[PDB]
Design a protein around this ligand. Sequence first.
Ligand SMILES: CC(=O)N[C@@H]1[C@@H](O[C@@H]2O[C@H](CO)[C@H](O)[C@H](O)[C@H]2O[C@@H]2O[C@@H](C)[C@@H](O)[C@@H](O)[C@@H]2O)[C@H](O)[C@@H](CO)O[C@H]1O
Ligand SMILES: CC(=O)N[C@@H]1[C@@H](O[C@@H]2O[C@H](CO)[C@H](O)[C@H](O)[C@H]2O[C@@H]2O[C@@H](C)[C@@H](O)[C@@H](O)[C@@H]2O)[C@H](O)[C@@H](CO)O[C@H]1O
Ligand SMILES: CC(=O)N[C@@H]1[C@@H](O[C@@H]2O[C@H](CO)[C@H](O)[C@H](O)[C@H]2O[C@@H]2O[C@@H](C)[C@@H](O)[C@@H](O)[C@@H]2O)[C@H](O)[C@@H](CO)O[C@H]1O
Lengths: 131, 131, 131
Amino acid sequence: GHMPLLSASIVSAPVVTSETYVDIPGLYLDVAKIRDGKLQVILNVPTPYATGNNFPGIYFAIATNQGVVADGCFTYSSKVPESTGRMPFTLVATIDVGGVTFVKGQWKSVRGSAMHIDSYASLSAIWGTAA
Amino acid sequence: GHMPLLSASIVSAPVVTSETYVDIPGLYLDVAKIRDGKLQVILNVPTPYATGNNFPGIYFAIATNQGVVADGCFTYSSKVPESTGRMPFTLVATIDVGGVTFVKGQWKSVRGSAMHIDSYASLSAIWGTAA
Amino acid sequence: GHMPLLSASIVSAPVVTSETYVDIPGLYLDVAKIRDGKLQVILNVPTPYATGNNFPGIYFAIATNQGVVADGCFTYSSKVPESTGRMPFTLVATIDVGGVTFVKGQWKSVRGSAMHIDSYASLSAIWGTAA
Ligand SMILES: CC(=O)N[C@@H]1[C@@H](O[C@@H]2O[C@H](CO)[C@H](O)[C@H](O)[C@H]2O[C@@H]2O[C@@H](C)[C@@H](O)[C@@H](O)[C@@H]2O)[C@H](O)[C@@H](CO)O[C@H]1O
Ligand SMILES: CC(=O)N[C@@H]1[C@@H](O[C@@H]2O[C@H](CO)[C@H](O)[C@H](O)[C@H]2O[C@@H]2O[C@@H](C)[C@@H](O)[C@@H](O)[C@@H]2O)[C@H](O)[C@@H](CO)O[C@H]1O
Ligand SMILES: CC(=O)N[C@@H]1[C@@H](O[C@@H]2O[C@H](CO)[C@H](O)[C@H](O)[C@H]2O[C@@H]2O[C@@H](C)[C@@H](O)[C@@H](O)[C@@H]2O)[C@H](O)[C@@H](CO)O[C@H]1O
């Protein structure tokens, strides 16, 4: 149709620790399957947790073929929290589509944390034009 | 008009405890008042808190006539926190409108928590098409 | 173009304490540079922290020429946390453009907190119509 909404959602990912950004499997939009204008991209990870022994947390990024375009993180406020609580995370970025063929979510450990998704997470994009 | 933006906002809700998803009163979009294509729905509860004595928290869901389409939660990282801090929460889901007549926000207790909204919260939807 | 996506992003702001809402520098959309219909506005501050000695936190607002349209906050759950963890924050509001010429992000201290952004934050708007 004429006003594309793109969405990918997952409910889990294998638990991993990574020093560097690695794809969150399943959070991937094939944009080439839009060639001009803009995409407002939301990465929504509403119920993540991190396990670790040095102020755990998770960095998240939005990436295209051109690499990371935006990132951010949550961290706990204790070195070893009593419980690794669920720390809702959302990241919003707008990309110029004019060598972008895909958008994806990525994550990376804070201080060696293991990264946990065990429920709904999504990557969404709304197509628009420049002003 | 030709590119509908839907929005509902509230500033409070009666405090309740619920084992199961119950509507957050006022976060409701009448979609039937769109019949094809997609809605990107955001549930934004930026300043909630939970009270309780067993690692309190709140689950939130986006639901249509067809039930819950996405959910997630925040939880505290202490069994009884010193203070029940404000834990911003956002949830994003894209729905195929092709027996959807309404979208609403819902919530449910984590471990018997009382659920508190006492400031701005919103439910938003942007209409688009399949790709 | 015919379906404008507006975006502004920053990676830092001078650290300040404020009793009242002050602009977050750089999170500003010139809307007048749209005169009818709606804007869905997202303020995304994914990696803020607050420093303070009385349950620190940050309030955030979306404002237009007409003032604040929505706000919310995060707060820590300890009076003086062991570490001031990163507390992702998102705020979503829909505005009727019919004396709006700009949209901006603002912030304000919780209990005298110093306010910290030292990585990506964004303010985004998608143009639509009434239903
Ligand atoms: C409070 C806490 O951290 N509990 C951990 C247990 O996690 C809970 O497990 C039960 C099933 O027995 C439920 O699945 C519950 O949803 C789990 O709690 C959720 O996840 C944890 C990690 C926290 O984020 C909590 O706030 C959230 O509600 C866990 O099964 C055990 C062993 O792995 O550790 C407990 O500390
Ligand atoms: C630190 C704390 O939890 N304070 C609680 C009190 O809540 C504050 O009340 C004052 C008015 O006296 C303000 O309204 C302030 O905004 C309230 O704090 C906010 O809400 C609490 C629940 C926390 O989320 C806090 O971080 C947030 O800023 C509360 O009135 C009393 C009794 O109910 O308990 C205090 O612990
Ligand atoms: C755990 C913690 O709070 N550490 C604080 C230090 O902040 C870390 O500094 C290192 C560089 O040495 C990195 O830049 C790291 O990313 C910083 O941690 C990040 O920011 C702090 C404020 C927390 O939000 C943390 O969770 C987050 O990962 C800081 O440099 C020093 C002195 O200012 O204080 C430490 O407590």
